Amino acid sequence: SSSIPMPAGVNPADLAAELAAVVTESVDEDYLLYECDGQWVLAAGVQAMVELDSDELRVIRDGVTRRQQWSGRPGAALGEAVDRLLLETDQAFGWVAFEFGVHRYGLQQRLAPHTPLARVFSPRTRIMVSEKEIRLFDAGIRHREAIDRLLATGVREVPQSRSVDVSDDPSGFRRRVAVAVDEIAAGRYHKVILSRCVEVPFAIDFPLTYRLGRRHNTPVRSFLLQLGGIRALGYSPELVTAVRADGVVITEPLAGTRALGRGPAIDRLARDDLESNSKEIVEHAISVRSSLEEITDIAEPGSAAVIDFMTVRERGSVQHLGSTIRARLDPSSDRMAALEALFPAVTASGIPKAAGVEAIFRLDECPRGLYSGAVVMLSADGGLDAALTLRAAYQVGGRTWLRAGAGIIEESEPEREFEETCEKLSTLTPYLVARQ
Ligand SMILES: C=C(Oc1cccc(C(=O)O)c1O)C(=O)O
């Protein structure tokens, strides 16, 4: 509801991130930038905030915090609070923790009090950036003036990045991998994704880092946020769930990994290896089966289908085997129920789910929080778009970190699994812009 023609030699990702940096800073506000199918949506300012925790639900608007106790499904509690936000505004944005998906698998009591499950907000203003134009939704005079100043200033040149060491293992990932391998060999579960955090020993400039890393990655979705004391950015390699206004539900499971970006002929050899490797084919097949079973739980009988099976999905520093699972949302179900059914992603949890999710509580640094959760965009028309939170950097308090994991199966070796985490961390490590 008002538009500005997109400038000549300006990329949408660069202008969207610059608007997020410069405009929100001049007004000192929180925001969330979400990239979805050629559109960069900047959700600027917080009109109301839904905070879902393990023990309480809070809705915060114009200084007033309303508290509620909730029981049963976290999805039903969040759904009720978000539908309310959406009666007022067209779109809501936020993040859903890994911990949101534990209730389905009987692990609710394992959550410590005040464990975040989700943060979803109604923005005061939305600025939508595409190749076509810049659209303004409910932008006030002060914001419009700040936008015009940004367009006249132009985009900042991105400085040289600063390197980070990913070779150290302070959290004993190699040790934790060996424990999971022993458990799988004993028949406890088939696969588990374990992870490790990597401390970034300097403050980074989130918008500039986002810009730099975006030039070198091909994610399904991307985000940049500053929300409630959390800064985060990511190049999501997978849609965990999308629910369209017409009832169509999609999930894009990934399983299997090879390095990418190492040179054309090297990348082709790795691509050919991935597509013919029995170990990778088996795991992908098993994951697509698990994913189909989950989507079946919320779909119209017999509406579930695999529309893309076992194809190479290129993701910057890595390439994965991917499938697309499509269904029709059953009338007895809803968008939150679909999210819960597909949560946490099989890709970043384990198989069987209940045993794999429980192994993560024992064998990984918990709560995972944003990592392996999702970044979400919800619409008043019933839409839900949820990007899997992998290939992301975070800043909370005075701490900046990266996080990456690997799929552990019976044949897994701690050394090769550690190397696999290095490949995934390389989606970001060469593009970290130091804060100036
Ligand atoms: C979990 C991470 O990445 C992954 C993505 C897709 C598949 C796998 C897998 O192991 O089959 C995988 O490990 C991470 O980037 O932290």
Query: Concatenated DSSP letters for 207-262?
Result: HHHHHHHHTT---SEEEEEEETTEEEEEEES-EEEEE-TTSEEEE--EEEEEE-SS
Instruction: Answer yes or no: are the C-beta atoms of 348 and 208 closer than 8 Å.
Output: no
Domain that holds residue 377: 1-436
Is 152 annotated in a binding site? The answer is no
Instruction: Answer yes or no: are the C-beta atoms of 2 and 134 closer than 8 Å.
Output: no
Instruction: Answer yes or no: are the C-beta atoms of 407 and 255 closer than 8 Å.
Output: yes
Give the atom of ligand 1 at the shortest distance from the alpha carbon of 237: 5
CA 424/CA 217 separation, integer angstroms = 12
Give the angle 283-344-198 at the CA atoms, nearest 5°. Answer: 85
Nearest CA to ligand 1 atom 12: 406
Q: Which residues, in sequence order, are CB contacts of 420 under 8 Å at separation 6+? A: 257, 406
CA 65/CA 8 separation, integer angstroms = 45
Q: Which residues, in sequence order, are CB contacts of 373 under 8 Å at separation 6+? A: 95, 96, 97, 98, 99, 100, 101, 344, 389
| Cα within 13 Å of Cα(67), Cβ side | 6
Instruction: Answer yes or no: are the C-beta atoms of 285 and 333 closer than 8 Å.
Output: no
Single-letter amino acid, residue 165: D
Instruction: Answer yes or no: are the C-beta atoms of 433 and 159 closer than 8 Å.
Output: yes
Is 283 annotated in a binding site? The answer is yes
User: Which of 344, 348, 318 is CA-nearest to residue 419?
Assistant: 318
Phi then psi for residue 339, to 5 deg, are: -60, -50
CA 260/CA 297 separation, integer angstroms = 35
CA distances from residue 220 to 214, 237, 385, 391 in whole angstroms, order as listed: 12, 6, 11, 12
Instruction: Answer yes or no: are the C-beta atoms of 402 and 429 closer than 8 Å.
Output: yes
- What is the chain's Cα-based Rg? 21
- Six-digit token string for 33: 């930038």
Residue with tokens 């401390």: 199
CA 320/CA 433 separation, integer angstroms = 27
User: What is the CB neighbour count within 10 angstroms for residue 305?
Assistant: 13
Q: Give residue 192 CA to ligand 1 midpoint distance, Å.
A: 10
Helix (H, G, I), strand (E, B) or coil at 428: coil
Determine what percent of the chain falls in helix, strand and coil, rounding each to the nearest 5.
35, 35, 35
Q: Give residue 120 CA to ligand 1 midpoint distance, Å.
A: 25
- Count structural domains, the chain: 1
Give the atom of ligand 1 at the shortest distance from the alpha carbon of 287: 11
User: What is the CB neighbour count within 10 angstroms for residue 105?
Assistant: 18
Single-letter amino acid, residue 67: R
User: Which of 164, 123, 125, 150 is CA-nearest to residue 23?
Assistant: 150
Q: Which residues pair with 319 in a beta bridge?
A: 258, 314
- Six-digit token string for 338: 């679909």
CA distances from residue 373 to 101, 234, 402, 420 in whole angstroms, order as listed: 8, 12, 14, 20
Element (H, E) at 34: strand 31-36
> Would you give the DSSP letter of residue 7?
P
Residue with tokens 């992603």: 345
Q: Which residues pair with 225 in a beta bridge?
A: 32, 232
Write the secondary structure of 371-413 as one string of H (helix), E (strand) and C (coil).
CCCEEEEEECCCCEEEEECCCEEEEECCEEEEEEEEEECCCCC
CATH code (residue 386): 3.60.120.10
- For the question of residue 238 being annotated catalytic, the response is yes
Q: Is the dihedral of CA 164, 167, 172, 177 positive or negative?
A: positive
CA distances from residue 286 to 111, 336, 343, 356 in whole angstroms, order as listed: 29, 25, 17, 14
CA 82/CA 59 separation, integer angstroms = 10
User: Which of 237, 351, 339, 239 is CA-nearest to residue 289?
Assistant: 351
CA 15/CA 30 separation, integer angstroms = 18
Helix (H, G, I), strand (E, B) or coil at 43: strand
Helix (H, G, I), strand (E, B) or coil at 419: helix
CA 45/CA 22 separation, integer angstroms = 13
Among residues 35, 51, 183, 238, which one is catalytic?
238
Nearest CA to ligand 1 atom 10: 407
Q: What is the best residue among 98, 173, 194, 257 to mutate for testing ligand 1's pocket, by most ligand atoms within 8 Å of CB?
A: 257
- Six-digit token string for 205: 């400039």
User: Which of 11, 301, 302, 316 is CA-nearest to residue 134?
Assistant: 11
- The strand pair at 39-53 and 57-61 is best described as antiparallel
- The residue count for the chain: 436
- Six-digit token string for 61: 């608007």
Instruction: Answer yes or no: are the C-beta atoms of 429 and 164 closer than 8 Å.
Output: yes
For ligand 1, residues with CB inside 6 Å are: 193, 195, 237, 254-257, 320, 347-348, 390-391, 404-407, 424
Nearest CA to ligand 1 atom 13: 406
> Would you give the DSSP letter of residue 263?
-
Q: Is the dihedral of CA 303, 256, 407, 97 positive or negative?
A: negative
Q: Give residue 397 CA to ligand 1 midpoint distance, Å.
A: 27
Q: Where are the beta strands (DSSP E) in 252-355?
A: 254-259, 305-315, 318-328, 350-351
User: What is the CB neighbour count within 10 angstroms for residue 32?
Assistant: 27
Is 144 annotated in a binding site? The answer is no
Is 417 annotated in a binding site? The answer is yes
Give the angle 349-95-382 at the CA atoms, nearest 5°. Answer: 100
CA 392/CA 220 separation, integer angstroms = 13
CA 373/CA 378 separation, integer angstroms = 16
